[PDB]
Amino acid sequence: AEAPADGLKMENTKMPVIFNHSSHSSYQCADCHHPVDGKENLAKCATAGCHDVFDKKDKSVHSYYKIIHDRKATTVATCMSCHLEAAGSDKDLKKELTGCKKSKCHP
């Protein structure tokens, strides 16, 4: 399938983020849209039964906060864990890519 246009809003929370597929088009679709039950899975992350727990303290697979903000990952990358690798030791990239505010995720 085809990546959607840029400027997509992730707005399940009071701290929404703009996701641009163009900034991520060197990654395989399934790197984020991981298959579920052996079928292609393009459903929104916080779909009921999926990543639908919004408690930030929740560490279960259902935590919406975890799958985005976890600094470490193994099987599927988080937003954070990949960006921490890309920013690395770099000062400005850490700011743009990994910061909690004044970043490109959370301006």
Ligand code: HEC
């Ligand atoms: C981009 C890679 C991000 C960085 C860097 C940080 N966060 Fe984030 N955040 C991101 C997304 C995609 C979302 C969900 C957007 C939506 O509304 O659908 C969030 C949301 C949050 C929230 C609200 C969570 C909730 O209310 O359930 C918080 C409190 C939050 N983010 C905090 C946070 C902190 C503390 C960070 C620094 C360590 C940080 N974010 C970075 C994406 C990204």
Ligand code: HEC
């Ligand atoms: C990780 C960095 C991703 C890669 C690589 C690709 N996509 Fe994606 N996509 C990603 C996120 C965080 C979201 C928002 C989901 C949400 O819960 O809001 C999306 C969204 C889509 C959608 C849905 C668009 C809509 O109008 O709801 C589609 C159809 C989609 N993405 C397709 C897609 C394809 C085909 C990709 C490979 C070429 C691809 N994406 C890459 C994260 C990531």
Ligand code: HEC
């Ligand atoms: C419901 C059918 C889901 C949707 C839609 C999305 N995910 Fe998911 N996720 C789901 C399951 C059943 C699992 C179990 C483990 C597996 O690899 O199948 C996961 C796992 C993840 C993880 C790893 C979490 C962990 O505990 O280490 C991540 C980081 C993740 N998923 C991300 C993710 C994103 C970004 C999604 C939207 C684009 C998304 N998932 C959709 C169930 C479902």
Ligand code: HEC
């Ligand atoms: C690695 C596999 C990544 C994952 C998973 C996510 N992102 Fe990412 N992102 C990645 C790189 C290497 C870059 C720099 C490339 C560039 O074109 O600048 C980015 C960039 C962003 C940005 C900044 C630019 C922009 O599109 O506004 C944002 C806001 C961003 N990425 C958000 C984001 C979110 C919310 C993710 C989780 C769903 C996520 N990215 C995953 C690498 C990777």
Ligand code: MOO
């Ligand atoms: O944006 Mo919230 O009210 O911490 O789930």
